[PDB]
Amino acid sequence: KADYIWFNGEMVRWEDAKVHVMSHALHYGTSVFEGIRCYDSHKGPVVFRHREHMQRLHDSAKIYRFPVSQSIDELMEACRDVIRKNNLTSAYIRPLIFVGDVGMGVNPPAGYSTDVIIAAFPWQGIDAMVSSWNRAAPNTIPTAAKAGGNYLSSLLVGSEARRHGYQEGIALDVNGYISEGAGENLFEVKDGVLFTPPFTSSALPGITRDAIIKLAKELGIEVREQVLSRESLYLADEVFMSGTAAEITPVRSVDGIQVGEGRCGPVTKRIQQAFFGLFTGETEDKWGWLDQVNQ
Amino acid sequence: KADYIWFNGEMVRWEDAKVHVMSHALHYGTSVFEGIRCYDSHKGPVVFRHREHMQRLHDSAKIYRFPVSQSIDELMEACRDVIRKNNLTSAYIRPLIFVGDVGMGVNPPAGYSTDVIIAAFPWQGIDAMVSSWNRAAPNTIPTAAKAGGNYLSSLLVGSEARRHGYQEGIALDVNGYISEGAGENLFEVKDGVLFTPPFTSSALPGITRDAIIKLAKELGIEVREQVLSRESLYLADEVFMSGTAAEITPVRSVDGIQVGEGRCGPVTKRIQQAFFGLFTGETEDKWGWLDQVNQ
Amino acid sequence: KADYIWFNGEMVRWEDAKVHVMSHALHYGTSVFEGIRCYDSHKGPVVFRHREHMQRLHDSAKIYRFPVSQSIDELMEACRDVIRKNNLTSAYIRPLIFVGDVGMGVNPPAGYSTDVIIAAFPWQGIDAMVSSWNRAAPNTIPTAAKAGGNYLSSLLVGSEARRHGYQEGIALDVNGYISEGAGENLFEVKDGVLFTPPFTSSALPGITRDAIIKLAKELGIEVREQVLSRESLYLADEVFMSGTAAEITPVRSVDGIQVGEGRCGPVTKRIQQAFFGLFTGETEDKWGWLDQVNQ
Amino acid sequence: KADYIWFNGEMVRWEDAKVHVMSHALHYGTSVFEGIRCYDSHKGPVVFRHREHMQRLHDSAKIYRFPVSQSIDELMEACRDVIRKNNLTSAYIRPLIFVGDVGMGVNPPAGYSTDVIIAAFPWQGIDAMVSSWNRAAPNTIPTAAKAGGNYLSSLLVGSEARRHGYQEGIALDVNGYISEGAGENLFEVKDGVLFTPPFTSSALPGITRDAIIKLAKELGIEVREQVLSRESLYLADEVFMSGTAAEITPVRSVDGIQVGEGRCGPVTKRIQQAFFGLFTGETEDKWGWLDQVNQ
Amino acid sequence: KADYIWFNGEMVRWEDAKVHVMSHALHYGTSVFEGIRCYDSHKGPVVFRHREHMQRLHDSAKIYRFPVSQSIDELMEACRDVIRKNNLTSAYIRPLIFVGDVGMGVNPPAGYSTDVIIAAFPWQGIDAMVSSWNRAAPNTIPTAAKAGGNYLSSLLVGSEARRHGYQEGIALDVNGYISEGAGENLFEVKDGVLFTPPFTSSALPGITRDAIIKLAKELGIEVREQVLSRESLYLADEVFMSGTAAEITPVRSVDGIQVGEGRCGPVTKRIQQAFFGLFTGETEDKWGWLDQVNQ
Amino acid sequence: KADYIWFNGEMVRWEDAKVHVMSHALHYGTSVFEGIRCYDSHKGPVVFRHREHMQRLHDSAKIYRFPVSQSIDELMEACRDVIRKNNLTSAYIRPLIFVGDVGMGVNPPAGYSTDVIIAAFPWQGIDAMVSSWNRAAPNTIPTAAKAGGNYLSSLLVGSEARRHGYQEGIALDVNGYISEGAGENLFEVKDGVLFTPPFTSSALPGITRDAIIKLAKELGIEVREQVLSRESLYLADEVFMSGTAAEITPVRSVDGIQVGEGRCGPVTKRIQQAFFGLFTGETEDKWGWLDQVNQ
Ligand SMILES: *Cc1c(COP(=O)(O)O)cnc(C)c1O
Ligand SMILES: *Cc1c(COP(=O)(O)O)cnc(C)c1O
Ligand SMILES: *Cc1c(COP(=O)(O)O)cnc(C)c1O
Ligand SMILES: *Cc1c(COP(=O)(O)O)cnc(C)c1O
Ligand SMILES: *Cc1c(COP(=O)(O)O)cnc(C)c1O
Ligand SMILES: *Cc1c(COP(=O)(O)O)cnc(C)c1O
CATH class of the missing domain: 3.20.10.10 (D-amino Acid Aminotransferase, subunit A, domain 2)
Incomplete structure (x- = not known):
């Protein structure tokens, strides 16, 4: 566990990264996620296969059509910030893109959006x-x-x-x-x-x-x-x-x-x-x- | 929407029914849920097939071995309490049992418990x-x-x-x-x-x-x-x-x-x-x- | 074999019931057909399960969407005419509804039509x-x-x-x-x-x-x-x-x-x-x- | 369209290439066919992969045991004859081997033969x-x-x-x-x-x-x-x-x-x-x- | 154990019911068997749904085409004789029908024969x-x-x-x-x-x-x-x-x-x-x- | 035929390699076998891909968990001995591994044992x-x-x-x-x-x-x-x-x-x-x- 979790653009203390019980993801399964490592290397801190993990993030969403506003470059920046901010050297990074509080309809409403989170903790x-x-x-x-x-x-x-x-x-x-x-x-x-x-x-x-x-x-x-x-x-x-x-x-x-x-x-x-x-x-x-x- | 969501026993102001972002159900889709209708009848409010729906909430968790503290009658009373405290007549009820902020591994740490939440809104x-x-x-x-x-x-x-x-x-x-x-x-x-x-x-x-x-x-x-x-x-x-x-x-x-x-x-x-x-x-x-x- | 074959509305001698080699049905399989009997009964000539055979004819076409202009009643009349005209008492009747000379595209062109034939011969x-x-x-x-x-x-x-x-x-x-x-x-x-x-x-x-x-x-x-x-x-x-x-x-x-x-x-x-x-x-x-x- | 369709050997005026209505292929879909393109090239007219297409016409019938009188070279010459006699340059060729007016039983009467027809039209x-x-x-x-x-x-x-x-x-x-x-x-x-x-x-x-x-x-x-x-x-x-x-x-x-x-x-x-x-x-x-x- | 296993129509001391090691069944799994119970009843020793088990012995062989000399009744009597002869009241009867010392070729030679056994032991x-x-x-x-x-x-x-x-x-x-x-x-x-x-x-x-x-x-x-x-x-x-x-x-x-x-x-x-x-x-x-x- | 079938480590006149009628394999099809050829070569009698056939004998049993006392080499030598001993140059060798007179229960008792044979006859x-x-x-x-x-x-x-x-x-x-x-x-x-x-x-x-x-x-x-x-x-x-x-x-x-x-x-x-x-x-x-x- 750590402090700070990137969340929709900004860094939030670990404890305030909360969401409503009626977020779509909690009831319908509608989220998409990744698993990325960060190793301390001979030159590291280094995250192993970053771009490729974030492009997969984007692809999982493409299949389901969860609109995503961040770019792979925006998302990678973020992940580096979370690491750095948390003063981690070897960690398990966890991006999640889920359908938030939107209604209780399986097919979320038009022009809705996803909330995106990026947390990390030591490995x-x-x-x-x-x-x-x-x-x-x-x-x-x-x-x-x-x-x-x-x-x-x-x-x-x-x-x-x-x-x-x-x-x-x-x-x-x-x-x-x-x-x-x-x-x-x-x-x-x-x-x-x-x-x-x-x-x-x-x-x-x-x-x-x-x-x-x-x-x-x-x-x-x-x-x-x-x-x-x-x-x-x-x-x-x-x-x-x-x-x-x-x-x-x-x-x-x-x-x-x-x-x-x-x-x-x-x-x-x-x-x-x-x-x-x-x-x-x-x-x-x-x-x-x-x-x-x-x- | 309404105010008051039964959450693990207490009734909480709807805006306050929040869940941490690292809750298991968000990432791994582990939660089970039901849909129940309250009709106004020639005597209603009347919850339709209330018991069958709550038994099914129990069958669904039994199947994935999610541990449910509440009996079937606790759940029913709580659904009726939820209707009343919100002064509802015809509504849609959504009971959700879900793996909470147990760790980040797929197999939740043994001896963990679920979080139940019953919410109702008009229909x-x-x-x-x-x-x-x-x-x-x-x-x-x-x-x-x-x-x-x-x-x-x-x-x-x-x-x-x-x-x-x-x-x-x-x-x-x-x-x-x-x-x-x-x-x-x-x-x-x-x-x-x-x-x-x-x-x-x-x-x-x-x-x-x-x-x-x-x-x-x-x-x-x-x-x-x-x-x-x-x-x-x-x-x-x-x-x-x-x-x-x-x-x-x-x-x-x-x-x-x-x-x-x-x-x-x-x-x-x-x-x-x-x-x-x-x-x-x-x-x-x-x-x-x-x-x-x-x- | 006999004389006369009902064909698109009129009775034609057996020998002139011809069609172009570029009819759709000959190349693509696009026809639909039935098999109906006519028995000489204690009251017969009688065709066994007429309406039900013609309704099947109509259903086969419904699945494929071959527009059909005749009604089941029109089609049954026809079948009785063919029998009578041919002076048959016990026969095998054969209705066919096929996509005629329309182009060489699998999906026939709009507002096209089927040609319908009804032939009979002794059994x-x-x-x-x-x-x-x-x-x-x-x-x-x-x-x-x-x-x-x-x-x-x-x-x-x-x-x-x-x-x-x-x-x-x-x-x-x-x-x-x-x-x-x-x-x-x-x-x-x-x-x-x-x-x-x-x-x-x-x-x-x-x-x-x-x-x-x-x-x-x-x-x-x-x-x-x-x-x-x-x-x-x-x-x-x-x-x-x-x-x-x-x-x-x-x-x-x-x-x-x-x-x-x-x-x-x-x-x-x-x-x-x-x-x-x-x-x-x-x-x-x-x-x-x-x-x-x-x- | 064009005039002249090679039919069982002779070239026939397109309007005359008719087939009886009781031909097997109309009712039972028994026919086999191919699509060949004639391109005008730096030397063309040139039939593209002509032999492979004609061999395939033969493979397809072999599989259903439809008897084909013509060799592969007879078929090719006939396709070239068809192009010429219609004065074509770039066309679409459609060879079709089909069970003709053999009886009305699914298994055609042994010793029957097919009818081949090659037609070309511009493309x-x-x-x-x-x-x-x-x-x-x-x-x-x-x-x-x-x-x-x-x-x-x-x-x-x-x-x-x-x-x-x-x-x-x-x-x-x-x-x-x-x-x-x-x-x-x-x-x-x-x-x-x-x-x-x-x-x-x-x-x-x-x-x-x-x-x-x-x-x-x-x-x-x-x-x-x-x-x-x-x-x-x-x-x-x-x-x-x-x-x-x-x-x-x-x-x-x-x-x-x-x-x-x-x-x-x-x-x-x-x-x-x-x-x-x-x-x-x-x-x-x-x-x-x-x-x-x-x- | 017990002593006396029926065998191709004769009773044989238990230790003499031996079969050559190059019997079809040991190599190719070509035997067919049944499970039958003898119950001491309010009138038994009584064999449970005896004939139906023998009919099924026949059916199992009919499907694999294994030939069978014995009628159902002979198999039945032989079943009884094995019970009496061994002085049993309650046992598990086991009839086998197997392909014997016939060749090492999966398809037994023509006109061959299946050997039949009927062991019964106390249950x-x-x-x-x-x-x-x-x-x-x-x-x-x-x-x-x-x-x-x-x-x-x-x-x-x-x-x-x-x-x-x-x-x-x-x-x-x-x-x-x-x-x-x-x-x-x-x-x-x-x-x-x-x-x-x-x-x-x-x-x-x-x-x-x-x-x-x-x-x-x-x-x-x-x-x-x-x-x-x-x-x-x-x-x-x-x-x-x-x-x-x-x-x-x-x-x-x-x-x-x-x-x-x-x-x-x-x-x-x-x-x-x-x-x-x-x-x-x-x-x-x-x-x-x-x-x-x-x- | 021939005389001398190896058998649990001993050579035995062909007519004495007998096995009791209540051997697992005859009832339940629990044997495992191989097909091997001895070829008279430009230097043979020579056994073809002998070891690979013996390894596979092992594999077949490993999968069904049948226990095996003999090493590959012992099976190999035994194969040779059976060839020589029978004075053969070209034959078909048949090694079997089967569950013996163990009980009538599909799961052999614990710590049981498979009987092993190796017949070879002229091919x-x-x-x-x-x-x-x-x-x-x-x-x-x-x-x-x-x-x-x-x-x-x-x-x-x-x-x-x-x-x-x-x-x-x-x-x-x-x-x-x-x-x-x-x-x-x-x-x-x-x-x-x-x-x-x-x-x-x-x-x-x-x-x-x-x-x-x-x-x-x-x-x-x-x-x-x-x-x-x-x-x-x-x-x-x-x-x-x-x-x-x-x-x-x-x-x-x-x-x-x-x-x-x-x-x-x-x-x-x-x-x-x-x-x-x-x-x-x-x-x-x-x-x-x-x-x-x-x-
Ligand atoms: C995440 C995942 C993997 C592991 O993938 P890596 O992308 O190599 O980290 C394998 N199988 C399933 C089911 C997974 O979701
Ligand atoms: C809930 C559900 C239904 C309908 O359930 P009722 O109990 O009749 O409310 C049907 N299909 C799926 C996939 C469902 O989840
Ligand atoms: C036509 C047909 C039948 C026979 O149907 P009846 O309508 O009883 O005359 C059965 N199987 C197939 C494949 C058929 O097309
Ligand atoms: C003919 C055909 C094709 C394409 O064939 P080419 O020989 O490349 O012309 C593909 N699918 C189906 C079902 C076809 O009939
Ligand atoms: C033997 C057998 C049974 C039981 O059959 P009963 O006649 O009722 O004893 C059931 N399943 C399998 C696979 C069996 O072969
Ligand atoms: C025995 C067997 C073979 C042949 O295997 P070889 O080692 O090559 O002799 C092939 N198919 C089946 C079903 C067999 O069991």
Whole structure:
């Protein structure tokens, strides 16, 4: 927790960042959000993949049509201010754009607007389990949009797992194929080859997942994106999840069945290092993923 | 609007019913809610199917394991208190149980509690359109729960129709069979028979829908809950929707194709007469659907 | 073959009933048609279920929106004229409403019209087989509409069967459940109970199928409409198909597996008799299904 | 229009190319057909991908076992004869093989033959809409065949869009993934990459689509045939359709949501320049796509 | 154990009923079996719905075309002889029909034969879990047949449950609706109304399930065979399984959610009573369901 | 036949490898097996991709959790010993792993054990038919495992074919795309390009299929593992199956439609040659696929 939360343009003390109980988002799910990290690097404070997280913010809203007045540049400025103002060096940043107090109609009224908030606060395998709950089918609720009411599904998958002793629930899609974990993407390593499910497998265009396939590429790793069947979890040699909060989580077991040697992940280790190496200097920011706060 | 919103037990001045910005339900759509109508009748104010609505508030949370402190009777008294203290007669009541300012993780920290809030405020066919979006598939995000997050889907089906000049969009399930309108059930009359999709067609078990089947049975109309094909909409003699806020709306054209002779639903008529005769005294409340405020 | 074919209002000799090679129907499938019988009865010439066949004609067009100028009464008059003029007593009548010479655009041009034709000409089990071709999925091509391009599917199912020695191909739907034969409905008799698939099983609202469930009812037979699984063909006690051309066809084998005693059909026999009994006088036209030509 | 339609070998005065009204293709949609463009080029008249189109005429009939007397070269000569005898330069050619006046049963009487007829006549983005109808499912009515009956589906997807003010409706397959427009393929550009659904998404293997992939490869653009989710349409940088009659049409908005900056597709541009440069001589015909009439 | 297993028509000491290791069934899962109970009654030893279990043995083989020398009556007498011969009063009878030492080719040689055995040996709620595995889809492996290859599904659903602490795994079909538990049918109770999945939900046509439906009809309960959703499990008042070896087991928590008051089962109890009273003499065996070994 | 079947670590005269009739596997289909070939080579007796077949034996059991005492190497040596001991040069080796005389309960008691056997005995196109049965759906019965319960599917597809005159039945998945034939993988050839269904099409990860992909890559052919449609079968230039006992069989007509010229198979032939040349010495065994019995 901290002080100050950027909110509709201005910095507000943590405690006065309040909203009415009749805001649309609280009843209908109508908000859209992001997860961004800020690492202290060899040059950092640096936020990892800023522009790309804010452009996703804008895209989630585009799908739903929540009018948004800030620009990606305005929004990135803001996020840097929140960090700086709060005197944070390594934090989890959280932008949210939600339909505020507007009526109680599902279809908000014309020329209405969203209120936008940006808060920040300081920041072997694990045994996953396959869940009985499937992820969202296709043309039903946009899995590409990172919208707030999507997380009901992440709640179902996640709790079920925790409730039984695991640390993660991997969900299948309505087709019976692997989609992803409760709230983060799933990678398998077979014979030294990469492999993740495509988005049509109701997976979400993770930005970490993205950085990974790229590093995998610099690292000389073939990467195949394709539909994975349940069984593959039992036959893979490595399995690991990715996400802004998690980064790279080795999964050493799935349904109790050991995933090769009980976590060791030679490929995983290589990728991990490529990853952290970025904040250390060992890895070249070929692409331009670090955006210092203190510029 | 009104003044006074029952919030966790106390009545609060409406302008003061605020919630912090980091409340779980805003970000992750975790909240559950209901819609209840208060009608003025031949004796009313009379809350319609008050108990069924409150039980359903409880079923919906049971399904997501959200912890509710209040019993069903506490909730009912509080709804009646809310009506009175605002000096209301005919209103719309909105009870909302939601995960509050528990932390920022999807699985709320065990032993947390919800916040309940009850708010009340005063309160031919129509040309529907079949929508391009589909309702949630079966074992993904439970459609039998009136939950927050589900609403992204009523928004998608709902704006689309408005956007093209219709007054309601009817959604299909992932199998291509009729589900229900954006936020309300759908019925059709064929050779004087009733017909409405099963919950298995991704239809919410509606409290109004339930009332209509009962009345129908008393009016001696045969009723068939059965899966329906998109084309029946164009071949039916009558079609109409029902919901707590829309009672029974007849539909005169679907996709521009006139549902049998541009409205005058004889059966829709009789059912509209039975339903309203409840509040008039013409229809004998045999199930005990009306619950006065001042008792 | 005969002389005279009603065509757009007038009677034309069989040989001059011609149309341009660039009529829309020949290239795009855009026609809609019916099959009606005319039996010589104890009072007949009588056409069986006239109005209901012409109303279906009108409904197929309604789904597709092929403007039609004739009325059901105009069209029935016509059909009686064609019969009478041709001096037919027992015939197969064939109305067709197709998009004529209009352009080569799939979406015919505004205020265009259809040309309508009405021609007539004189009019154990069988071993069916289950086909590898599935029937049309749901919201793809209206199985309720009896449109001309639908018959590609009937061609696939039918030829496959004939090509292998059977007399009929029963098709499953995309779900793996029984839908119907190539061009006629499928009934199973289990323990003295009826059973046919509903339309949502991509079956077509056969008018014979309709008369059957009715007679079944007068006859004291319970009738259940529901989703049948493949296996049921092997476990049923009776199986039989229906259609305007076929009437009631006992199926004594399916995939070589005998369907109870190699056709005997006690229930089938009862229904059959109820059916023919109609033209004989033995059965009462409770419903009003005979429409004499010579009135 | 023109005068002279090649009909079963002879050239006939256009007004005389008539077919009896009881021809099979009118009632049962049994006919197969193609669309070929004749362009005037830096040497043209030049029939574009003439052989591929005629081979496809043959593939489509092979699939339904319609017997074709003419070889591929007979058909080509006849198409060139048709162009010449009508003194055409730039035209649209329509070859149609169809079941003629064989009897009235769905399975045409063995040893029957088709009738072929070849006719020729002279010849920002656009705002598409995602349709409420779905394209044919996999093993129902073969979508790899350009057949008559399939067209009921292009009509349904096509009028709907027109009916609501769009210039094209994009259809989804029964799985909720993008199939293709009403009668033409769909492509998207993302980070400068190409992407187009597989035939398995119920997409017809288009001859123009094929040309575009080839040119694209020569322009050095990466191409990915992969299943696509409805939402990619709103997130893509460019989107455009292709068909023999519509070449390459860019799409500027889908569902009212602007596809990246309301048209100017850089890549669509380059591909439009390569494709047209064929007829100009700027693009070297390496595959041999142009086939002169006068040779 | 016991001694004397019937075997191809002869009784054989238990230790001599051996079969070669290259018997079809051990490699390819080509056996078909039954589960039958002998009950000590108010007149028993009495075999429960003996013939119906033998008819189904026949049906299971008829579908896979396995040949059967023995009539139902011979199988029945042999069943009795095995009971008497072993001096049993209450046991679990197990008849198998399997493909023997025939070749290593999946299609047994023509005119082969199945070996037959008949072994018989002496014979609050539970807490089910919804399984992460699904049951056979429709036209894949006939589910109306108790083939032994099937039990790989039961093996996976049941061990998942056991491994996690539960005592029964309930499985969903491919559609996501409820099917049945690992080895038994599933009934739900709502407002004193019955409810169970039909076969098309990939439910074996249980013989107990049927007994129960028949009883309930006598008790005057209404029954609804209708498709069911996962969530209905957490909202019913009572849920219970049935099968030859579990008779009528009550479930009291599903996924750790109480089925309306940690068991109390009112309708469940009326049923069990009526069930067991058939053995006691209290329930009239109106149907003829009890066959005494000693006749 | 032969004499000496390995068995739980001992060699046993062929007639003494017997197993009790109440062994799990005969009732419940709980065995797991492999198909291996011993080839007389330019240096053989040589076992083809021996270890990979033994690893897969392990994998099949790992998925069903069947316990295994023997290492891969012990299974390998035992394989060799059975070859030598029987004085064989070319045979078909069959290793089984099955659940023995454990109880009649679907879940074997804890700490139980699987019995292991290893029998070995001496060891134009075809005309396939598309089957009316489909293959296991995705998360129902793991298809990446060669369990024996599975072969009920192979049993149904293959006998359908044989019964109708064909010699192989090709099966579709539940989606309607192509899966594989009764017992072997299916490859198609188009414009000198390879093509086969991925596993998610419910295709067993064949060991021949893999060999073939590897060869073709050496021959410089391009390969595409991609989902395939039924109709692609009638349009490819060459189609062929593969499996341990069929090596590489060419199909020349599918459903009675010639696969481009009643076999001539150019790419098919380059493959077979490269295949067989591994045994002759012509093809370099770059991978190490041949294990000599005598080491
Ligand atoms: C947020 C999210 C992820 C993680 O995405 P990153 O953008 O890589 O931080 C993965 N799956 C779901 C469901 C998510 O919403
Ligand atoms: C609330 C709701 C209905 C209608 O409910 P009633 O209880 O009849 O008020 C229908 N569909 C959806 C999605 C709903 O939320
Ligand atoms: C025409 C038709 C039938 C038969 O209908 P009747 O109207 O009973 O004559 C059945 N199935 C299909 C596919 C048909 O088009
Ligand atoms: C003909 C057609 C196309 C486009 O074909 P081209 O060969 O590129 O002309 C696309 N979709 C459908 C349904 C078509 O018929
Ligand atoms: C054996 C079986 C049952 C129970 O059937 P009963 O005749 O009633 O004992 C139920 N489900 C499955 C999968 C079974 O095979
Ligand atoms: C055994 C099997 C194959 C063939 O596998 P190979 O290792 O290549 O012999 C293919 N399909 C099925 C269903 C099989 O089980």
